[PDB]
Design a binder for this molecule. Sequence first.
Ligand code: HEM
Ligand code: HEM
Ligand SMILES: Cc1cc(N)nc(CCCCCCCc2cc(C)cc(N)n2)c1
Ligand SMILES: Cc1cc(N)nc(CCCCCCCc2cc(C)cc(N)n2)c1
Ligand SMILES: C[C@H](O)[C@H](O)[C@H]1CNc2nc(N)[nH]c(=O)c2N1
Ligand SMILES: C[C@H](O)[C@H](O)[C@H]1CNc2nc(N)[nH]c(=O)c2N1
Ligand SMILES: [Zn+2]
Lengths: 411, 407
Amino acid sequence: RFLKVKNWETDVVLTDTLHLKSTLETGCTEHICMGSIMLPVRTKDQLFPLAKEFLDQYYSSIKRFGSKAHMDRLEEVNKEIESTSTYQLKDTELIYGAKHAWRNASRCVGRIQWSKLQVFDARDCTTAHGMFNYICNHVKYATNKGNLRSAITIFPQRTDGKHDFRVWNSQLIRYAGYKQPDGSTLGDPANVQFTEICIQQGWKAPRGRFDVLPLLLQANGNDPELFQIPPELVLEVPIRHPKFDWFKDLGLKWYGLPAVSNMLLEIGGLEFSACPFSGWYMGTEIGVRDYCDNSRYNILEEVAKKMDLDMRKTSSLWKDQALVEINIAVLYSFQSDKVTIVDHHSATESFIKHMENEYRCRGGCPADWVWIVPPMSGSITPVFHQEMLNYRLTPSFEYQPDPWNTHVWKG
Amino acid sequence: RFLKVKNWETDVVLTDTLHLKSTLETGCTEHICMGSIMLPTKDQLFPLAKEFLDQYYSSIKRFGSKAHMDRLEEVNKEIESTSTYQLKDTELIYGAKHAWRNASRCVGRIQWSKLQVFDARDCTTAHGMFNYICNHVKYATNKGNLRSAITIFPQRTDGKHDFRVWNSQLIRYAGYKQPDGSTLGDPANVQFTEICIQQGWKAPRGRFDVLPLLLQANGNDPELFQIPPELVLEVPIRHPKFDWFKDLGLKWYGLPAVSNMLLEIGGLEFSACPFSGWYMGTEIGVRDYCDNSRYNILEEVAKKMDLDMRKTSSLWKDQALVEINIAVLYSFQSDKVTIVDHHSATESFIKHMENEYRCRGGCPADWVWIVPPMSGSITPVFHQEMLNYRLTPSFEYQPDPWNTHVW
Ligand code: HEM
Ligand code: HEM
Ligand SMILES: Cc1cc(N)nc(CCCCCCCc2cc(C)cc(N)n2)c1
Ligand SMILES: Cc1cc(N)nc(CCCCCCCc2cc(C)cc(N)n2)c1
Ligand SMILES: C[C@H](O)[C@H](O)[C@H]1CNc2nc(N)[nH]c(=O)c2N1
Ligand SMILES: C[C@H](O)[C@H](O)[C@H]1CNc2nc(N)[nH]c(=O)c2N1
Ligand SMILES: [Zn+2]
């Protein structure tokens, strides 16, 4: 079977065969497309197939498919699963696995970078204090004084699902949000609930607009524990505008390191419930979403007032104008301080080259158009006009429920 | 099997039950999503008719009535005897309005019940088609106070006698390839212009030449007709602060009017059914002007603005884009030609969508098309989950007729 995708700007047509390896489901059927829906313990029985499929992939990639080493490794994992009910990945398999979960991440525009990923193996970790130390080292390595380096840290896999490692933070670095009695919000409205949990667990909140949240770390299924990331490890950029001198007085700043900590990494049927990973920002994640979503810092109106735009009618495009200026400011600021950042033109162009390369060398590149297209200026980026096919390959990153909904409190 | 959609900005959650009445296929499977692919006998006809007339009689609250049973029997006898049937005027009007209502890619559906339907089923020649189309254009244009309309030519019979408008829109600009190797005019219309030239059109060879209509009646060879120039309302494009903008020599036409789609009602196929509304600004300012494969003017505008075009990260493309879109809205407004901006249009669509969930149990919507091509996430549709599925009556794509027509 061959599926074809067209680029409507270039008329370039690509042929996908890779979708023949998809397994998980999309959410869609022949009768309903769920392409814009945000959220669409295993037995021995299901596990060996999942292991075998992964190991066949790994051994093929190293050009040892069907070798003695390959056969011995299948046998060894088979027996391990039979007597212990799970198995342990070799370091090389873990590295390959983590890289491939990124490569397979259909919502990620940054995948040209997938093969450069520093993998920190934290499977010897046993306590929350151990987790903290691992996470500080990740943050310090990844930050690299502004010259950002992609990295992932992987904590022990799930066993009975009663002993899970979890980072309760959605990202390693994020700002607190506090709902005020008057119904307004100080800081980041997205993190209000998590901030209440931190406070309830005994965090002493500074109660400012940009308070870096503490880490809340669960090891081996125990109750989570609080830790403050050392401030000197948290690189931040004050936001200023190249021509507008009043922009700095809005008091805005952001952190340099985007680091997702709430996802589940699946490799060969194993589940790594704590696997924080980080890269560097595309400017629109801060300038469009973090700053301009109505449910976030929501600064559009204030910016447009200061620019003296005509705000009496939407048709003056005042919002569009302020939006662009805010995004110029974010890129200017990061660049001026030498903190790695990529604009949405550069990132989507690199993504299309990556995608074409993948079709040629791998036979496809699953991609989720809804997420890949940037949240401003969509159609003047080359991804807008590119047809894409979304399907699920393993290894993969998956959503998991927030741990405060599922955690069995010990006390 | 009953589905929830959430808005991630407002936390409003709606339940879709309408999708259970969905009929055609999406292109998607449980293994692969094709959400971003642009194009993913008496026996068959009676169920299609019944399904339609049932929904019709339900809508006027006469479901199961004698008049309902009588029409069903009437239509059944007509199909068995004639191999087809004819819609009552009321059914035709209901069906055309519902095809718009069901158009999952249309942001402007709050307006769906205000559609003037022109019944041209009595039309027999290409000359007749031309007269009907001029009247549509004039009625819909209304000197700039635009009114939604559709004109419906006779339905398909044996498929050898199709009515077709060969143009993709009633009003579009010609495209010509130059000795230079560049393109003069609209690059999207190069092929269609060639056919027009080939059929005899005398091309002016300008940058904004309104194409002639190429009209096919009763499966005959199509004929050329020029729309009276005084019926084509055009708008010169200027900017409220940039004095130099008018010197780019840009204009666009006021009436967006799709002419290449097929309207299916109760199994009957209307292969020529031009329909028109009014523009959302970004259709002209982002797509028509700024697509690389269309008028592609970003670079010229950026240069006149004197932006740093050395690096993508100065966001010069984005700045010039916004300015071009301001100019479009400004020019249409100054000349009192109806236009809607993408903020106002998407806000209306969210209100429409809540009405439809409340009153109909859902609203099929294709997010990839609903979200405007600029400033996506500052419009409320970006944060709105949508379910895409196909309901009839419907507008459908059909093959370009020159690939199909036996000459
Ligand atoms: C190298 C720099 C990177 C850039 C510029 C980048 C870019 C992005 C962007 C813009 C998004 C969408 C975020 C949003 O709009 O909310 C995203 C999503 C994602 N990326 Fe990346 N990415 C990078 C590195 C990585 C790395 C290192 C990984 C994992 C190893 C990764 C895995 C993911 C995943 C799983 C998603 C989807 C998240 C979700 O569904 O919530 N990315 N990427
Ligand atoms: C009244 C003002 C209207 C507005 C503002 C509007 C808005 C739009 C927009 C922005 C698109 C996407 C266009 C593109 O990106 O190429 C669209 C698509 C569409 N609209 Fe509307 N619309 C209007 C009236 C109508 C009417 C009167 C009908 C039918 C009677 C209609 C049926 C459709 C269909 C079938 C599509 C998708 C066309 C395709 O798939 O090629 N619209 N609409
Ligand atoms: C409801 C919901 C579901 C979901 N899957 N994801 C979200 C939040 C989306 C935020 C993604 C975080 C940033 C992604 C990212 C990750 C990395 C590693 C680098 C970079 N530049 N950007 C919400
Ligand atoms: C290959 C292909 C398939 C397809 N379905 N559509 C296209 C392009 C779509 C052209 C859309 C025409 C304009 C839409 C429109 C129509 C109306 C009636 C009003 C308004 N404001 N805008 C290409
Ligand atoms: C409903 C819709 O799917 C949702 O708002 C999505 C749309 N596209 C997105 N795209 C990216 N990159 N990030 C997001 O958070 C979203 N949100
Ligand atoms: C590949 C992608 O589906 C295609 O370029 C679409 C994207 N969204 C669109 N949305 C609208 N309204 N109109 C279009 O022409 C397109 N093009
Ligand atoms: Zn789908």
